Amino acid sequence: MIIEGDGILDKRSEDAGYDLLAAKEIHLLPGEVKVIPTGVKLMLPKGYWGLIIGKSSIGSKGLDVLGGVIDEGYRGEIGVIMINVSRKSITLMERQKIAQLIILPCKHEVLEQGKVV
Amino acid sequence: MIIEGDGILDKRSEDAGYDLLAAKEIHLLPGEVKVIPTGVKLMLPKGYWGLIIGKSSIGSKGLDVLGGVIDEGYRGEIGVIMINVSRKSITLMERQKIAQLIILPCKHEVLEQGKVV
Amino acid sequence: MIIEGDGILDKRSEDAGYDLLAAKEIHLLPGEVKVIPTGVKLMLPKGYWGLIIGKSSIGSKGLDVLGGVIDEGYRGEIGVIMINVSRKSITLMERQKIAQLIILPCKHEVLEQGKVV
Numbered sequence: 440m441i442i443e444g445d446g447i448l449d450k451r452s453e454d455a456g457y458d459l460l461a462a463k464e465i466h467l468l469p470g471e472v473k474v475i476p477t478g479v480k481l482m483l484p485k486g487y488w489g490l491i492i493g494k495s496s497i498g499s500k501g502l503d504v505l506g507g508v509i510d511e512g513y514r515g516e517i518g519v520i521m522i523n524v525s526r527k528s529i530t531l532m533e534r535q536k537i538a539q540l541i542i543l544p545c546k547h548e549v550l551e552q553g554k555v556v
Numbered sequence: 557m558i559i560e561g562d563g564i565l566d567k568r569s570e571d572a573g574y575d576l577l578a579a580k581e582i583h584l585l586p587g588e589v590k591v592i593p594t595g596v597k598l599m600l601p602k603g604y605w606g607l608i609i610g611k612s613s614i615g616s617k618g619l620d621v622l623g624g625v626i627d628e629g630y631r632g633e634i635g636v637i638m639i640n641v642s643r644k645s646i647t648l649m650e651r652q653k654i655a656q657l658i659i660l661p662c663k664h665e666v667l668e669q670g671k672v673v
Numbered sequence: 674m675i676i677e678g679d680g681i682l683d684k685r686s687e688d689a690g691y692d693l694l695a696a697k698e699i700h701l702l703p704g705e706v707k708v709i710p711t712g713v714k715l716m717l718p719k720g721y722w723g724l725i726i727g728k729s730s731i732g733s734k735g736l737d738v739l740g741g742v743i744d745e746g747y748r749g750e751i752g753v754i755m756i757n758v759s760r761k762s763i764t765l766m767e768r769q770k771i772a773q774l775i776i777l778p779c780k781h782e783v784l785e786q787g788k789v790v
């Protein structure tokens with residue numbers, strides 16, 4: 440797919456997602472929420488959406504990823520919503536790996552009001 | 557698919573999930589976990605499951621979604637498990653958008669005890 | 674698929690994921706992150722990855738699952754990264770159900786540097 444920016448990395452065939460980098464240094468105190476920018480935009484292929492999910496290295500540090508749904512039509516820059524849910528302060532270096540992007544299939548249903556049994 | 561209730565909204569073709577609304581007003585103090593009700597039930601199509609995932613607007617407020625797996629056979633009402641992982645108190649208005657439902661494909665494997673190399 | 678270990682349970686046709694058990698007793702104080710071991714390894718089918726996601730029973734207790742992406746090529750033992758984001762202490766008994774594994778499809782794209790409109 441078409442992407443702009445260098446905040447996203449090519450992956451191998453055997454990996455599920457693309458590593459996303461932090462565009463600038465970020466400090467987070469316990470309980471702080473900050474939207475970390477990546478500087479990348481992309482054109483998800485028709486019929487698919489992107490899921491931002493955490494990496495074990497940052498997660499093991501007590502950092503979590505919130506939200507995480509990239510809609511196919513989105514063209515803005517991708518941002519990773521991170522929170523320090525640990526009890527110690529953390530600094531994420533610039534261009535550090537903070538999350539992963541996984542491309543998944545779309546399923547559109549019509550909503551039918553009825554009675555589910 | 558068949559649904560009952562008005563706590564879920566039709567989406568566009570370009571969106572990955574359906575917005576879920578809160579059935580009643582909810583207050584959450586830092587560190588509090590509450591199962592927010594939506595009032596909706598649904599009949600997921602055979603071969604698929606539903607994933608409840610967070611929205612960037614509430615997530616940016618320090619709210620996270622836990623659990624999140626709707627099994628195809630479930631017919632009960634859908635509930636969103638939310639926690640205030642931020643350091644400030646939050647109130648979710650009635651019928652406010654709190655999460656998103658995404659329909660994904662099922663893959664059933666048989667478990668073979670063996671030796672993975 | 675081929676698995677080794679008894680920390681993972683067969684599921685029904687109607688369930689989305691396989692329950693994962695804790696290999697040993699674990700205590701977690703508010704705000705503590707610990708990688709809970711399961712003792713299971715597996716050979717994900719080619720073309721798929723595994724997603725570790727939370728269960729409503731533990732999630733309703735204020736426990737969250739971080740990270741969660743099993744790459745198809747991984748052969749090591751599966752570990753569940755858990756954090757107590759609640760305000761009370763928790764003990765997870767040995768062989769207790771702590772998470773769920775869901776198998777999802779892989780989508781590999783080539784990264785094309787361009788200009789997204």
Ligand SMILES: O=c1ccn([C@H]2C[C@H](O)[C@@H](COP(=O)(O)O)O2)c(=O)[nH]1
Nearest residue numbers: 506507508509510513517518611612
């Ligand atoms: O963690 C996230 C979640 C969302 N978006 C973007 C891309 C989506 O298309 C858009 C959607 O908004 P919500 O539906 O999450 O509010 O926001 C991000 O950059 N990061």
Ligand SMILES: O=c1ccn([C@H]2C[C@H](O)[C@@H](COP(=O)(O)O)O2)c(=O)[nH]1
Nearest residue numbers: 623624625626627630634635728729
């Ligand atoms: O956040 C959640 C998670 C689960 N369920 C429901 C629908 C599922 O079929 C059922 C499954 O239970 P667990 O397997 O998550 O314990 O609970 C919810 O309403 N909300």
Ligand SMILES: O=c1ccn([C@H]2C[C@H](O)[C@@H](COP(=O)(O)O)O2)c(=O)[nH]1
Nearest residue numbers: 494495740741742743744747751752
């Ligand atoms: O919650 C998790 C996340 C990852 N892994 C394993 C399997 C993956 O193939 C590997 C990948 O590492 P990261 O890409 O998450 O850093 O770690 C786990 O056991 N548990």
Ligand SMILES: [Mg+2]
Nearest residue numbers: 504505621738
């Ligand atoms: Mg999550």
Ligand SMILES: [Mg+2]
Nearest residue numbers: 503620621737
């Ligand atoms: Mg979380």
